[PDB]
Amino acid sequence: VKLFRASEPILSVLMWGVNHTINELSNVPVPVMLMPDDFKAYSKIKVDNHLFNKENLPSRFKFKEYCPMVFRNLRERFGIDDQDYQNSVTRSAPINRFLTTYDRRFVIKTVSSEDVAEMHNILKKYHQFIVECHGNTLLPQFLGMYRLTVDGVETYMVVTRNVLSHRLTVHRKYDLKVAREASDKEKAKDLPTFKDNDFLNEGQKLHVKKNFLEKLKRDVEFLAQLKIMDYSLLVGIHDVDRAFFGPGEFDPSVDVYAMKSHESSPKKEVYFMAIIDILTPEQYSKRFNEFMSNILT
Amino acid sequence: VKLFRASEPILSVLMWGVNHTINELSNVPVPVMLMPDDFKAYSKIKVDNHLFNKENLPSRFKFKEYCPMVFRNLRERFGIDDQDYQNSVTRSAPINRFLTTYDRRFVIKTVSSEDVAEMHNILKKYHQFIVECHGNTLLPQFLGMYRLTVDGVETYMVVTRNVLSHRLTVHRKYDLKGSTVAREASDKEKAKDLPTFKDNDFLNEGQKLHVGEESKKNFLEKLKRDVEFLAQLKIMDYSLLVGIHDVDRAEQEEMEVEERAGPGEFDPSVDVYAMKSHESSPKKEVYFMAIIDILTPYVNPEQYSKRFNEFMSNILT
Numbered sequence: 094v095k096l097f098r099a100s101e102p103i104l105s106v107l108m109w110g111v112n113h114t115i116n117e118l119s120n121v122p123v124p125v126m127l128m129p130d131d132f133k134a135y136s137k138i139k140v141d142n143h144l145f146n147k148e149n150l151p152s153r154f155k156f157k158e159y160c161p162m163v164f165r166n167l168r169e170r171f172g173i174d175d176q177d178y179q180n181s182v183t184r185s186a187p188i189n190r191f192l193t194t195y196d197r198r199f200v201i202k203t204v205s206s207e208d209v210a211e212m213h214n215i216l217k218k219y220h221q222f223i224v225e226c227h228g229n230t231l232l233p234q235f236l237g238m239y240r241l242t243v244d245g246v247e248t249y250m251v252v253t254r255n256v257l258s259h260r261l262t263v264h265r266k267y268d269l270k271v272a273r274e275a276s277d278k279e280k281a282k283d284l285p286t287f288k289d290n291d292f293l294n295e296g297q298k299l300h301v302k303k304n305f306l307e308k309l310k311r312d313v314e315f316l317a318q319l320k321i322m323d324y325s326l327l328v329g330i331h332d333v334d335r336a337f338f339g340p341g342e343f344d345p346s347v348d349v350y351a352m353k354s355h356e357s358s359p360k361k362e363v364y365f366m367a368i369i370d371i372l373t374p375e376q377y378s379k380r381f382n383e384f385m386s387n388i389l390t
Numbered sequence: 391v392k393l394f395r396a397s398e399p400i401l402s403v404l405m406w407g408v409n410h411t412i413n414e415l416s417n418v419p420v421p422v423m424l425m426p427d428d429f430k431a432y433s434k435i436k437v438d439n440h441l442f443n444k445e446n447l448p449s450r451f452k453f454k455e456y457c458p459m460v461f462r463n464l465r466e467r468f469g470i471d472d473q474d475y476q477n478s479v480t481r482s483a484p485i486n487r488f489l490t491t492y493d494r495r496f497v498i499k500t501v502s503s504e505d506v507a508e509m510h511n512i513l514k515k516y517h518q519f520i521v522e523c524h525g526n527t528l529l530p531q532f533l534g535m536y537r538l539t540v541d542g543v544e545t546y547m548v549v550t551r552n553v554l555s556h557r558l559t560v561h562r563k564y565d566l567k568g569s570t571v572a573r574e575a576s577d578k579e580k581a582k583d584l585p586t587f588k589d590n591d592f593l594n595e596g597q598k599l600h601v602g603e604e605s606k607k608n609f610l611e612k613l614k615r616d617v618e619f620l621a622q623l624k625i626m627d628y629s630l631l632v633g634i635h636d637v638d639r640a641e642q643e644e645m646e647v648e649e650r651a652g653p654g655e656f657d658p659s660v661d662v663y664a665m666k667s668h669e670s671s672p673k674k675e676v677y678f679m680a681i682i683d684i685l686t687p688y689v690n691p692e693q694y695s696k697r698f699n700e701f702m703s704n705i706l707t
């Protein structure tokens with residue numbers, strides 16, 4: 094009995110909508126191939142209840158899902174079962190614009206209308222690229238894209254697989270990208286978001302092999318070839334020593350970006366690494382890949 | 391995996407709609423009491439898909455369900471699981487406005503805006519009457535009420551449990567009102583495969599139904615209660631539907647089917663209007679008898695009750 098009880102009403106709508114669309118999809122056959130119209134398609138449901146089920150849901154709301162067939166296929170190619178996605182979103186309200194599902198498995202990012210249009214422009218080439226990778230890639234893994242309408246205001250969301258581990262507490266986070274550095278406001282947060290200058294001014298390195306770079310070069314060559322800029326690389330460090338289940342112990346089919354540190358590392362660490370924010374040139378490609386090529390040993 | 395394949399889009403939308411509302415209802419807890427809000431409530435969904443899932447459903451339709459909590463409660467009170475209701479509507483399209491679910495268990499009647507109004511106007515008294523009779527009534531057992539919009543057109547439908555059996559063939563059928571006037575079946579009707587005979591055809595045929603004292607008394611007590619209730623609510627033009635199933639003929643036809651390559655026993659938990667004929671009776675028969683068509687408000691209602699009951703009393707011995 095899924096009460097869609099949430100910290101606030103828009104989360105109740107997100108839960109109700111992902112539950113709804115994923116069931117509806119379970120009654121839609123898996124095609125032999127996607128078709129171009131699947132790349133221009135959408136689902137839209139408008140709910141108008143009166144004196145009914147208003148306990149946790151709003152009474153009037155709208156839910157739209159962009160390209161349901163394309164994102165169900167992507168979900169498949171990334172190895173995510175549809176019922177697991179639905180459970181991660183509806184079993185418990187998502188948590189803290191940036192959310193994760195209660196089980197920290199997926200992140201729900203609020204995006205702009207421009208970002209939704211941009212993804213619509215990149216989607217067929219992105220999907221074909223993921224086919225040709227067999228999902229082995231450092232790009233964001235898009236699982237769904239939704240518009241919600243609550244109290245007249247529209248909100249747009251993109252669901253991606255979490256870069257960081259959903260079980261291991263991550264101890265230092267870097268948003269590696271002129272020159273950028275952490276605001277002292279951000280620098281005073283419970284888990285800071287250090288940017289590019291303070292990974293060099295701190296002396297951290299990540300000691301591992303070379304095939305990470307082989308995947309990254311393909312990814313960023315693709316991003317540039319699609320005229321995308323402004324993307325970052327997200328890096329997380331987990332210090333095993335800080336500390337049933339275990340320490341440094343993770344499932345690589347769930348934390349897909351995780352990487353064990355070499356025996357040669359000073360600290361006993363596990364790293365997580367992936368590309369983020371790819372919804373918006375060629376020079377960016379080379380400068381950014383250089384920066385990240387000089388951080389593995 | 392449910393395609394909702396149907397010969398007409400409206401049927402597909404009906405199947406989608408009952409599926410949707412029953413599954414939504416399964417996330418709403420089951421209340422201790424009904425609140426009065428529950429009798430003025432409704433649920434509305436408006437679907438506008440685009441290049442998506444258009445094999446069977448329309449891209450654009452609307453579905454409204456009335457007092458979903460009250461009819462869920464009624465379903466409970468009549469012994470019907472929500473899961474079974476959903477499955478009879480959605481496993482395969484309803485068939486031949488009048489339909490029954492593929493498994494013959496429930497009847498789906500297209501009704502009018504005024505019928506929906508009168509159903510609201512009587513629903514609270516109807517629920518309490520069902521409550522204080524424990525579901526023991528000849529009246530229609532209402533399980534759902536919906537409004538479909540396909541191609542900008544609104545269709546109201548009312549779901550009821552079948553007066554007739556879902557297994558036993560029904561060989562003769564009458565629609566009796568007890569009216570002073572000459573209710574007789576047209577040559578048109580009388581020329582159909584299973585015609586619905588009316589009063590004067592029931593009398594000019596000398597049909598009686600030997601049911602036996604115990605069932606006859608339960609029946610006449612049920613009917614007296616029910617039609618006093620209808621008179622209280624100023625309701626008229628309701629009929630008694632009677633179906634006769636010939637056990638021997640059923641066996642003959644059954645064997646003529648099996649030759650191309652119990653008997654007369656029914657389950658009163660599903661065929662709730664069903665009665666076996668008396669031990670010492672001419673032919674082995676099974677009857678189904680219930681009241682139908684009770685959504686038309688205001689011969690007076692008390693006068694209608696009187697004439698109706700006086701007629702139905704002597705239709706069975």
Ligand SMILES: O=c1[nH]c(=O)c2ncn([C@@H]3O[C@H](COP(=O)(O)OP(=O)(O)OP(=O)(O)O)[C@@H](O)[C@H]3O)c2[nH]1
Nearest residue numbers: 429430431454502503504506507508510511537544
């Ligand atoms: O005594 C009542 N209590 C009610 O609670 C109630 N709810 C509906 N109705 C009757 O239903 C019919 C039209 O159907 P409906 O009302 O569903 O259409 P609508 O006017 O709401 O929508 P729309 O056609 O403008 O889009 C009309 O006779 C409504 O008066 C009720 N009568």
Ligand SMILES: O=c1[nH]c(=O)c2ncn([C@@H]3O[C@H](COP(=O)(O)OP(=O)(O)O)[C@@H](O)[C@H]3O)c2[nH]1
Nearest residue numbers: 191200254255256257266268286325327369370
């Ligand atoms: O636990 C997390 N798992 C993630 O997978 C994840 N992805 C991003 N973030 C954070 O959100 C902002 C990036 O957002 P962005 O889209 O790259 O850029 P912008 O600030 O323009 O929105 C920064 O604060 C990032 O540290 C994540 N946190």
Ligand SMILES: O=c1[nH]c(=O)c2ncn([C@@H]3O[C@H](COP(=O)(O)OP(=O)(O)O)[C@@H](O)[C@H]3O)c2[nH]1
Nearest residue numbers: 488497499550551552553554565586631682683
């Ligand atoms: O629960 C039921 N199971 C049935 O199997 C059944 N068959 C008919 N009816 C009712 O009887 C009248 C139609 O009789 P009809 O003469 O065939 O058609 P109509 O009078 O509209 O021309 C209407 O009240 C129908 O809803 C049935 N009710």
